[PDB]
């Protein structure tokens, strides 16, 4: 038969540099999972009981998270940094280092 189940509360999202912070306020023990859409995924899943905060990395490829019984939500990160990419040479190198550290 067809069997009725509630939908979890929507979490609170705060952005950041290659990171997101999620405030989760559950009413029942709920399953929370997340993964990255890259070559080697950093999959994770856990049971949440009380109100909590979590930090999730979002690479330039993408992240997908599943909370409660809602549809999975996907996020992507743009190429953002500090420094002018058309100024003095030290600003050039600092901006490029902000993009990729090791290569620069």
């Amino acid at each position: 038969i067809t069997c009725r189940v509630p939908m979890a509360r929507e979490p609170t999202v705060i952005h950041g540099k290659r990171e997101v912070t999620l405030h989760l306020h559950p009413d029942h023990p709920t399953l929370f999972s997340y993964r990255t859409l890259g070559e080697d995924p950093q999959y994770h899943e856990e049971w949440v009981t009380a109100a909590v905060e979590r930090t999730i990395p979002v690479p330039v490829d993408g992240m997908e998270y599943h909370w409660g019984n809602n549809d999975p939500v996907r996020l992507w990160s743009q190429l953002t940094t500090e420094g002018k990419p058309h100024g003095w040479p030290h600003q050039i190198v600092q901006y490029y280092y902000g993009l990729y550290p090791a290569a620069t």
Partner: protein, 438 residues
Amino acid sequence: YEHSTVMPNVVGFPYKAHIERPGYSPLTLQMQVVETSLEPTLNLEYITCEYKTVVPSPYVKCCGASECSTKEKPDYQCKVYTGVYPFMWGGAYCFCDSENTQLSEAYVDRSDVCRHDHASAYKAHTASLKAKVRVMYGNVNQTVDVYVNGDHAVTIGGTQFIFGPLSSAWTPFDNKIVVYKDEVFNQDFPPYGSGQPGRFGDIQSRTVESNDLYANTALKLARPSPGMVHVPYTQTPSGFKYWLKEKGTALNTKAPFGCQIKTNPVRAMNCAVGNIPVSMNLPDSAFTRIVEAPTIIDLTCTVATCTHSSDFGGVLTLTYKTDKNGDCSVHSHSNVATLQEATAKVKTAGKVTLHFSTASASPSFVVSLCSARATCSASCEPPKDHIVPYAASHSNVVFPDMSGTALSWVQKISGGLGAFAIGAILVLVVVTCIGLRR
């Protein structure tokens, strides 16, 4: 006419394909991939479900003896015990104080319900791919389903399309998989006839309708307690429930490349990897003569704004001189930047505007409008928003053009140093030659 090209296997990424032949106006094709499904070929090995234990009523013989013979039945276990004194509510059961024998036996059979609830074991082979592609050009806009294997061919508007084969042969399923309800698990399972008690595979069957069954559950009987009628037995619990309790992490939350796993039939959808080569054969009715198409002369390009972001964060303006108003096909001849629209309208005014997306700091690309071409170079700045909810709409290129500010600086530094080095070499050569003259 015949043509061939390659497209990226990313769902939702637009592709502009430029086809030009002498004597006919250039054409632009819009190709998109809406969904892709990868399904492997399976060979069923066995199924597993919960079991049940049948223990019939024990046999009691007063002033006598009994012996039991073996039977062909899964994990049949029989025993006979002597010196028993059964009791019930009415009182004693037999005259003989110590000449009574109790015959007990038990066996195991599959659950009457596990037809609905069972887990299957499969071996995975080479997988075939099918896809859904949307094609746009002129007054034609249609979505068709194709097999990406290099054999299937489709016809749209008198045009033949052939897709595949895929460049990289990569599959997420390993050799052995286990399927339950709507989840798949990439785990190794014991071969048939070698199951172990308490773990996955306690009971086995070739198929759901099989009349045979192989079970190993360590059915051990024991002597009944004095003055009672019952058949004690100890047996390890069902391994199917144990596996259900700590199966692990399903492939749905672990599969790489962000592609989704579905069952009935088992498949992986939207697996973004590799590139798809497409071949095409076109008729002569889809082109237009040079005489009918407008003529564009003295084309120059200037950029207005550039901010390399996921969306189309770049706008530029194109100036031209024409002879009659009409429609032209606009294309970007380099992978560094991607255009949004493929067909533009040209009038006597001579000004048009275009939107494009890029990733490099200082892009440089050739833009073609009808039969004319021009070059564009731009200076761009990074965006400020950190996280956005739409996928990237540009190919990831980062290396700047040789005319960029940073590359100009390094070129000037290297040029000065090289000139100084050449001067040193010339000075030393002149000095040593003058010294050798004497």
